[PDB]
Design an enzyme around this catalytic site. Structure first.
Site, mmCIF file in Angstrom:
data_model
loop_
_atom_site.group_PDB
_atom_site.id
_atom_site.type_symbol
_atom_site.label_atom_id
_atom_site.label_comp_id
_atom_site.label_asym_id
_atom_site.label_seq_id
_atom_site.Cartn_x
_atom_site.Cartn_y
_atom_site.Cartn_z
ATOM 1 N N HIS A 356 0.814 -1.224 0.000
ATOM 2 C CA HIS A 356 0.000 0.000 0.000
ATOM 3 C C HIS A 356 0.850 1.277 0.000
ATOM 4 C CE1 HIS A 356 0.216 -1.176 4.372
ATOM 5 N NE2 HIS A 356 0.559 0.093 4.489
ATOM 6 N N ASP A 412 -1.683 -7.523 0.623
ATOM 7 C CA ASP A 412 -0.796 -6.369 0.848
ATOM 8 C C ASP A 412 0.660 -6.858 1.007
ATOM 9 O OD1 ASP A 412 -1.070 -3.326 1.449
ATOM 10 O OD2 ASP A 412 0.247 -4.051 3.052
ATOM 11 N N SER A 518 3.378 0.382 10.235
ATOM 12 C CA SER A 518 2.718 -0.074 9.004
ATOM 13 C C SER A 518 3.703 -0.938 8.231
ATOM 14 C CB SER A 518 2.257 1.106 8.141
ATOM 15 O OG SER A 518 1.716 0.659 6.906
#
Ligand SMILES: *[C@@H]1O[C@H](CO)[C@@H](O[C@@H]2O[C@H](CO)[C@@H](O)[C@H](O)[C@@H]2O)[C@H](O)[C@H]1NC(C)=O
Ligand SMILES: *[C@@H]1O[C@H](CO)[C@@H](O)[C@H](O)[C@H]1NC(C)=O
Ligand SMILES: [Mg+2]
Ligand SMILES: [Mg+2]
Ligand SMILES: [Mg+2]
Ligand SMILES: [Mg+2]
Ligand SMILES: [Mg+2]
Ligand SMILES: [Mg+2]
Length: 575
Positions: A356, A412, A518
């Site tokens: 992402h 992802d 993340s």
């Protein structure tokens, strides 16, 4: 309009300004408010073709209708014209707004309602949750009128006699046991033939079980990967992308087939499934912190892993100990200097990072091999630690074409490549990974999941006043959550592809399910081998954005032989 004294001036306001007219210095006379003059003014001037009268005006100051174009609107509806959730103003998922979350309070940019906070190029609007489309106008009625701005479209859902219809039925044994005639992919590329002139060449030392024939050009799975099917394709030395199909729920958490006791006496019962040269080391020498595991000293969080121990409470943020998460990567930006996203150190020469925060053209983003840098072994995000960390230039990226930011974070899962070898150390040490027969058995017993970081996930998605990014490394534990429990919490559709893990939430609070980084480390200590196996990738979740929710992490037990086909390319590309 609440107490005696302040309601008195309501009648004063009504006479002069509304029916007749008024100016700034007239208003400042019996009003007695230095700031609230400007709020009225913004609401009054917003009524452009709405000077008089009161019956036709009525709710222009009350803020529940749309006149001319409609900069008066402050009303209360969750949805827009079609049927898509309006995003919260000071939240930034999916698409980040051009006007920030601080400059303009005039139109009151907060909570899940429509506005028109600049100039009406089409109508009054809210940001979509659907990450394909950008914006959409909200159909509010007109002040003193029954008339609508734009037509409504509900978007139906069908299967029985709506689609075509197809009813193809399931695929067992992850695409080993299947035959067909396909010729499509995710983006759309024509599959190449096996027996021709571009496939047969690259096959001279690897695992097989030839139960089936070689069938022309179709998407197949001979080497026996637990995922799906792929074909070769053309271009500047082209990659391989998986042909997409429908699959059934294989109970990875409750696998069916025909206090407990602890292990200890064993250094490593590991699988040597790769060949350390192209793939690089860190298969054997991983999951063994030199400061903890080699010296054999328990951390604090090994005496509180069981769900049975002291039942359960909300566990607060933590300041981590010295050097207890050597698996960590901190991806930065070159010009300007900017911390972006996270990665997980998997070997001496591989970088499993988030997808992402890599390719995302709604943010204007084609920053490739030049404009990146990774840093390993960082405790202080603020300071520079010249020796215990060091700099690491980057090489080629690799894509997993199932990767769909456009729809709903399907896989992802991407990979980077360093140039140098990162040398091993007392501070630096990569993490191991398990397969299907190792990973699935771990979550039969109620073992917690660990996440470390600095709350990089938190800051990158919400503006969020109250709390901020610390210098110290975060660390936190999370129990397990059931399958249909997480399915009936949210109405939006989800799959076994990802998974849910958080605490029992409150009524009037955010929660502590938004820490870590993340694309950071999601790991779990082994009770068998005294090892550490990574079993998660941190991406977007409902635990951050929404309230009363759990953090959402991607599975990694699939795609084992995906890396095995990639390591073949590193040898031929050089020289
Ligand atoms: C709009 O968004 C609201 C966010 O809280 C939700 O409203 C809920 O309405 C129900 C009524 O059944 C209450 O039980 C609950 O307390 C909450 O207020 C809901 O997602 C949505 N509501 C409507 C009417 O569209
Ligand atoms: C980024 O720019 C290059 C340079 O021309 C271009 O060829 C490429 O299409 C872009 N990257 C991607 C992933 O499309
Ligand atoms: Mg009056
Ligand atoms: Mg007057
Ligand atoms: Mg005056
Ligand atoms: Mg005056
Ligand atoms: Mg006056
Ligand atoms: Mg006065």
């Amino acid at each position: 309009a609440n107490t005696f004294l302040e309601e008195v001036r309501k009648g004063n306001l009504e006479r002069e300004c509304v029916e007749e007219t008024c100016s700034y210095e007239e208003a400042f006379e019996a009003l007695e408010s230095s700031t609230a003059t400007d709020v009225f003014w913004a609401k009054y001037t917003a009524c452009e073709t709405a000077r008089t009268p009161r019956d036709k005006l009525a709710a222009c100051l009350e803020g529940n209708c749309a006149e001319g174009l409609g900069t008066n609107y402050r009303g209360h509806v969750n949805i827009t014209r079609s049927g898509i959730e309006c995003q919260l103003w000071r939240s930034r998922y999916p698409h980040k707004p051009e006007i920030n979350c601080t400059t303009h309070p005039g139109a009151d940019l907060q909570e899940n309602f429509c506005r028109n906070p600049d100039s009406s190029t089409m109508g009054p609007w809210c940001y979509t949750t659907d990450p394909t489309v950008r914006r959409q106008e909200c159909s509010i009625p007109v002040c003193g009128q029954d008339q609508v701005t734009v037509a409504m479209t509900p978007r139906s859902e069908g299967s029985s006699v709506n689609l075509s219809p197809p009813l193809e039925q399931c695929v067992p044994d992850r695409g080993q046991q299947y035959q067909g005639r396909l010729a499509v992919t995710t983006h759309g590329l024509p599959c190449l033939a096996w027996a021709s002139a571009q496939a047969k060449a690259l096959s001279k030392h690897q695992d097989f079980n030839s139960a089936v024939q070689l069938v022309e050009n179709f998407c197949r799975n001979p080497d026996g990967d637990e995922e799906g099917v792929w074909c070769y394709v053309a271009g500047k030395p082209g990659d391989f992308g998986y042909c997409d199909l429908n699959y059934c729920e294989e109970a990875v958490e409750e696998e069916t087939g025909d206090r407990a006791i602890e292990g200890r006496t064993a250094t490593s019962e590991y699988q040597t499934f790769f060949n350390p040269r192209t793939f690089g080391s860190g298969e054997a020498d991983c999951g063994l912190r030199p400061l903890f595991e080699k010296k054999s000293l328990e951390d604090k969080t090994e005496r509180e892993l069981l769900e049975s121990y002291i039942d359960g409470r909300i566990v607060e943020g933590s300041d981590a100990e010295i050097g207890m998460s050597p698996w960590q990567v901190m991806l930065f930006r070159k010009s300007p200097q900017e911390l972006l996203c996270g990665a997980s150190l998997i070997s001496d020469r591989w970088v499993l990072t988030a997808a992402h925060c890599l390719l995302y053209p709604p943010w204007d983003k084609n920053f490739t091999e030049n404009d990146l840098l990774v840093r390993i072994g960082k405790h202080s995000r603020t300071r520079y630690e010249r020796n215990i960390e060091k700099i690491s230039m980057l090489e080629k990226i690799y894509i997993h074409p199932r990767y769909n930011w456009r729809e709903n974070l399907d896989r992802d899962i991407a990979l980077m490549k360093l140039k140098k070898p990162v040398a091993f150390s007392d501070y630096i040490h990569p993490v191991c990974l398990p397969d299907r027969e190792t990973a699935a058995s771990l979550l039969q017993a109620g073992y917690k999941g660990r996440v470390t970081g600095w709350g990089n996930l938190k800051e990158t998605w919400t503006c969020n006043v109250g709390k901020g990014q610390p210098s110290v490394l975060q660390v936190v534990n999370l129990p397990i959550v059931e399958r249909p429990v997480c399915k009936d919490s949210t109405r939006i559709r989800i799959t076994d592809n990802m998974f849910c893990a958080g605490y029992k939430p409150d009524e009037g609070k955010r929660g502590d399910a938004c820490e870590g980084d993340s694309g950071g480390p999601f790991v779990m200590k082994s009770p068998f081998n005294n090892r550490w196996y990574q079993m998660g990738i941190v991406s977007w979740g409902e635990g951050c954005d929404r309230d009363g929710k759990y953090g959402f992490y991607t599975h990694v037990f699939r795609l084992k032989k995906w890396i095995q086909k990639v390591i073949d390319q590193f040898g031929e590309y050089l020289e």
